[PDB]
Amino acid sequence: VKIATTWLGGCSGCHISLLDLHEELLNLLENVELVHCPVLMDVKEIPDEVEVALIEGGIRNEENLEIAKEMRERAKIVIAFGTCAAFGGVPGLGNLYSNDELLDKAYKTTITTKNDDGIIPNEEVPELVSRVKPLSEVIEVDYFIPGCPPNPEMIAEVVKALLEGKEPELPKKNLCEECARKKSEEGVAIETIKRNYEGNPDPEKCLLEQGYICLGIATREGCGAPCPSSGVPCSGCSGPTDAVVDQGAKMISALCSDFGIDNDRDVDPMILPKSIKDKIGSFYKFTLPSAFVPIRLK
């Protein structure tokens, strides 16, 4: 089975997680004919007759667009490999600014930068597309593996399923399933909102009920919930479940519904927006390019 990988606007983390199969990477490569993979081999052009393709990263520049289209033509099955390819990922926060603001910061107004003619790199380099886009927005994507990065076992199950000819199926519940923290059977009620540096979070009580914006409730399971286990709220990196399109919108709906719910008719509805200084960054860390409004208008 000829497979190929490539990367676009990601950070290489999905490929590193693939290598974190460790011993199993060799067993995988014994059964698979890897015909293209920039990080591991020197095949420059994407060959024809690729059966499966792992594409990491979203679309950030014109070159990403052409490679995504070339891989779609060459590959039978295109897989959106990771959260960036599936939802846009952290680089999607660049949509909150124009490319000119992104470029002028990196190449003019950064404190150590020295550029006397004020040039923006433009020779032999691609221009950025207008906004970071999920892979499915520019090509047809047959499957996707969420996670930032996707855990190594999950990458193994998806691929081996396709080698066998079976459809891969991701887990469907939200994170609270896997998480070992204890909830109130009376339900979630939030009195105040705390930034993650405030107070001392109790190790066993659900962080959302303690007042911390935790994305576990709006995030698909599968990772094992290591962040809440390790003492910090979930940031939502795995993305939403199959029944939620806009992860940030749903988290906001849930958060607002239960804020002051024990005092429903009297809690001031302006306390919650005033306590959150960075709202897009609180709720759209990994998924902004796939939200209903994936940019800031200028």
Binding site: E23, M41, A106, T112, K114, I119, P121, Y197, P226
Partner: protein, 447 residues
């Protein structure tokens, strides 16, 4: 005539090499282009400053620990908090484990294919699969090193890729005595494998010297690396610059980096061109990374690495300017990090519960510095009174070898190419070998 090497393969990120010829057919211009940028420095504006250790690891999937720690340190200065000692050991423990994983990843899976097969036509063979089929035990040692390092990261950081435990004022969780015990049990095997890695490195660099390839991309430069009383240190100390003759030019705290470092911009690359602003663009070229850290350090911090480093200095002197000997320095750091993992796991403060101090008044300015696997890493954040980021600047490791890579690939072309017929598949791969020697991470360098 114009030739292009794209993509440059077995590196992290997107780069290409251009080779152009004039009307006579003579070599004309040779350039290294990095063709990616994402703009972290700008879109970090408006975020919660305490979320910086969440965003910046997504600059790269290889060295995500280094960014996590650099941001955490900057955040720890933004708030006026001094983290307790146990937190310091846990972060450094995670830092060494990551360095083990990164150095092993590069030498074995990215670099070694060239060192083993420097003059081959079989391009499908020049990869870990080609090494694994003829020398399987070498790739299994590589895998076991990465597995040991990532395992350290996962336990201390919560995840092997993009750790989350480094929070405002220390660590979000402590290390438990049982975890400490099995990590310490496993640490001995990592050290042995690192020693064996040095020996294979000797063999393969001998093979490189046999082919007259040990001096490709050679030029002389300054060198920068963090030292702690002149002792090689990846986590704490001051940044030391040594000139091409080995003389210490300056030693400065990373918070003053802007008074010593400047980054230039050229139109043909999204990757900037740093230099010692004092010396200028041409005379101020310096390097970072494994070999640069050895040149600036008086000694290593661990005994076994000291022995190989002393033996190496005796053979090549100080400072060494050979690009390809960055590979050997990488293997010494690989061992030194392995040893440091064990040493930190033996420090009884590693399992302390006093892991975090309450954040103090917001200073509004913080610089965080660590030696990433691929060189000095600086995170500089500025915030308002609510701790909302207003400005960020990132000087990320490999960017500081971009002049070295641009110079190197043209000096490789000068040595081997006179006419377009000389740019054979093997000679073009020589140019990529010069790139790979510096272990470039181009997503990191551009951010």
């Amino acid at each position: 005539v114009k030739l292009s090497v794209e993509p440059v393969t077995r590196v992290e990120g997107h780069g290409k090499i251009s080779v152009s010829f004039d009307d006579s057919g003579n070599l004309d211009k040779v350039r290294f282009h990095v063709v990616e940028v994402r703009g972290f420095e700008k879109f970090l504006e408006g975020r919660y400053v305490e979320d910086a250790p969440i965003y910046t690891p997504r600059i790269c999937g290889i060295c995500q620990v280094a960014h996590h720690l650099a941001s955490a340190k900057a955040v720890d200065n933004v708030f006026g908090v001094k983290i307790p000692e146990t937190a310091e050991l846990l972060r450094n423990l995670m830092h060494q484990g990551a360095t083990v994983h990164s150095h092993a990843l590069h030498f074995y899976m990215l670099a070694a294919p060239d060192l083993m097969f420097p003059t081959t036509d079989d391009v499908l063979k020049r990869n870990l699969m080609g090494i694994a089929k003829e020398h399987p035990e070498i790739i299994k040692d590589a895998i076991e090193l990465r597995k040991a390092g990532q395992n350290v990261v996962r336990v201390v950081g919560g995840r092997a890729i993009h750790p989350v435990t480094a929070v405002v004022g220390g660590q979000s969780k402590s290390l438990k005595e049982e975890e400490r015990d099995e990590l310490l049990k496993l640490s001995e095997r990592t050290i042995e494998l690192s020693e064996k890695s040095i020996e294979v490195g000797k063999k393969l660099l001998e093979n490189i010297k046999d082919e007259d390839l040990l001096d490709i991309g050679y030029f002389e430069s300054a060198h920068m690396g963090m030292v702690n009383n002149g002792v090689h240190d990846l986590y704490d100390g001051k940044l030391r610059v040594v000139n091409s003759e080995g003389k210490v030019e300056y030693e400065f705290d990373p918070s003053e980096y802007m008074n010593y470092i400047a980054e230039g911009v050229k139109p043909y690359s999204y990757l900037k061109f740093p230099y010692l602003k004092d010396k200028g663009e041409e005379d101020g070229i310096y390097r970072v990374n494994t070999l640069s850290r050895l040149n600036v350090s008086d000694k290593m911090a661990t005994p076994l690495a000291q022995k190989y480093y002393d033996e190496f200095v005796k053979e090549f002197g100080k400072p060494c300017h050979h690009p390809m000997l960055f590979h050997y320095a990488r293997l010494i750091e690989l061992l030194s990090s392995a040893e440091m993992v064990k040493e930190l796991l033996e420090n009884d403060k590693i399992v302390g519960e006093d892991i975090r101090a309450e954040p103090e008044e917001v200073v509004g300015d913080g610089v965080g510095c660590v030696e990433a696997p691929r060189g000095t890493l600086i995170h500089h954040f500025k915030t308002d009174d609510d701790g909302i980021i207003t400005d960020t600047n990132l000087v990320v490791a490999t960017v500081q070898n971009n002049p070295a890579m641009d110079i190197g690939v043209r000096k490789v072309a000068e040595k081997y190419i006179k006419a377009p017929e000389d740019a054979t598949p093997q000679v073009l791969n020589y140019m990529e070998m010069l790139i790979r020697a510096y272990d470039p991470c181009l997503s990191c360098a551009t951010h």
